[PDB]
Amino acid sequence: VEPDAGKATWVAASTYGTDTTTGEEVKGALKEIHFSTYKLAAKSFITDET
Amino acid sequence: NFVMPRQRAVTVERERQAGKQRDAYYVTQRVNLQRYFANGVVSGTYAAS
């Protein structure tokens, strides 16, 4: 599962190349989600004489 | 005598990658001027006061 993005900072209107002073967006980590399957059981019996 | 030697004429070249919202032009040649013997140029003075 990925996360949202993002915020980008707008320029200072005078800095048109060398250098542009825009945001550095950090490559969003893909987050694992893991699922665990638990078990249960029941037993029963009767005897053929009862 | 006074001859100027050259081995590349004026050339013109340009980029774009790895720029950043810019295109840019370069011009580069190779040349010099040489006094062959000793003399044959004279000027001044024509000093100051």
From Swiss-Prot, chain A:
It is found in: Virion. Interacts with the decoration protein; each hexon binds a single copy of the decoration protein. Interacts with the portal protein. Major capsid protein that self-associates to form 120 hexamers and 11 pentamers, building the T=13 icosahedral capsid which about 860 Angstroms in diameter. Responsible for its self-assembly into a procapsid. The phage does not need to encode a separate scaffolfing protein because its capsid protein contains the delta domain that carries that function. The capsid gains its final stability through the reorganization of the subunits that takes place upon expansion. DNA encapsidation through the portal triggers capsid expansion and the binding of the decoration protein to the capsid exterior. This is Major capsid protein. It comes from Escherichia phage T5. The gene is D20. The chain holds residues 210 to 259 of 458 of the full protein.
